Symmetry: C2
Subunit: 189 residues, 2 copies
C-alpha cells in the first residue's frame, strides 16, 4: 500500500511559530457574540481591533486514528473585566480526547460537559492537560505575557453544533481586584 510520508517540524517554544503551518489570525472583530460586556467589545474593535490569538495548525486528512497538532499564541487582554480567550472547540464526534501542552505564559482551560458542568484548570509552562471525551474547552490568558500552547487532537473530531457564538459557556473568567475569578456567565440559559 502507499504509506504516508512521516516528517519532523520545528517549533519555537518562545514564539509558538511552526515553519510551514497553516497560519490563522483571529482579531477581536472576529469574535462578535463571544464576550459578555458587548459595549467594551465595540469600543475596543473600532479603536485597535487587537489580535486575540494566532494558530499554527498541522492537520492531516480527517481519518480515524490519525492526529492533528496546533500551537496557539493567545495574547493578553481584557474585554471589560473578562480575559481574552480562544473561540472554544466543541467536537462533531464527541468522544474524542485532546492533549494540550503549556509552553510559555500564564493561563488555564475552561471545560464543560454538554449540560454545562464546569471545570477550570490552571496552566503554567510544563502543565499538560488531558481533555476527556464529551468535554468542551476554551483556553484563557490570565497573565500579562502571551500564552502559548501545543494542542494534539484526533483528525476526525471536527468542530460544530452545540454552538458557542450564540450559547457559550456556563462560566466566564474575569479580573476582580487584581485576583482571577471563575464566576457564573449571565448570558448562559
Amino acid at each position: 500500500m502507499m504509506y504516508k510520508e512521516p516528517f519532523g517540524v520545528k517549533v519555537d517554544f518562545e514564539t509558538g511559530i511552526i515553519e510551514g503551518a497553516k497560519k490563522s489570525v483571529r482579531r477581536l472583530s472576529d469574535m462578535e457574540g463571544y464576550f459578555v460586556d458587548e459595549r467594551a467589545w465595540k469600543e475596543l474593535v473600532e479603536k485597535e481591533d487587537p489580535v486575540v490569538y494566532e494558530v499554527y495548525a498541522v492537520e492531516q486528512e480527517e481519518k480515524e486514528g490519525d492526529l492533528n497538532f496546533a500551537t496557539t499564541v493567545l495574547y493578553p487582554g481584557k474585554v471589560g473585566k473578562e480575559f481574552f480567550f480562544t473561540k472554544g472547540h466543541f467536537h462533531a464526534k464527541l468522544d474524542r480526547a485532546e492533549v494540550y501542552v503549556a509552553l510559555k505564559g500564564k493561563g488555564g482551560m475552561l471545560l464543560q460537559t454538554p449540560e454545562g458542568d464546569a471545570k477550570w484548570i490552571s496552566m503554567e509552562p510544563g502543565t499538560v492537560v488531558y481533555v476527556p471525551p464529551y468535554w468542551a474547552h476554551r483556553t484563557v490568558n490570565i497573565g500579562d505575557e502571551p500564552f502559548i500552547f501545543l494542542a494534539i487532537y484526533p483528525a476526525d473530531a471536527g468542530h460544530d453544533y452545540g454552538t458557542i457564538a450564540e450559547k457559550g459557556f456556563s462560566k466566564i473568567v474575569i479580573e476582580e481586584n487584581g485576583e482571577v475569578k471563575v464566576v457564573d456567565n449571565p448570558r448562559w440559559k
Copy 2:
C-alpha cells in the same frame, strides 16, 4: 451520564519527570537481543547494567478516540558502536498516528513500514514528529546528555514489540569515526 474528570499534570522539561505518573525502567538487561553487538551487550551488563530509559506515562483505559501521553528520558550511551534506543513498537491496531515533541537533548527517530523501508528524522528541542499510520518506530539518543521527549498516541493503539527484536529494524544507528551514520542492520532479512 458518566463523564471522565479532566486534569492537569506537571511535566518538567528539564527532567522528563511527570509527577505521580508511574515510571517504567528498562535497564540494559531488559533489551536482550536488540543490539547488533551481543558480546559488548554482555560485557556492559556484567559491569554496570544501566538504565537505558525511563518512561513517565499517563494512560487511559483503551477506548477508540482516547489519547495517552508519556515522556521518555532516553539516557546516553552505546553498545559497541550502536547508540541506545527504545525497544520501539509497531502498534497492535496498525492505523494509528503518534506525535512526538522533543524537550531536551539530542537524538532522532527511526521509522519503518511493515515491508522494511526505513526513515530517519533528526530531533532536537522544538522538533515535533508526526508518526503516521502503519509505521513502527524507535527513538535513538545520539549525544552525551539524556534525550528527553513527550509522545501522544491513541489510547487503543496497543503494543507490538515482538516483530522488532525477532526481525529488527532494517537500519541501525551508530557512531563511526566520530560522525553519526545510518546504516543497514546486518541482522536484517
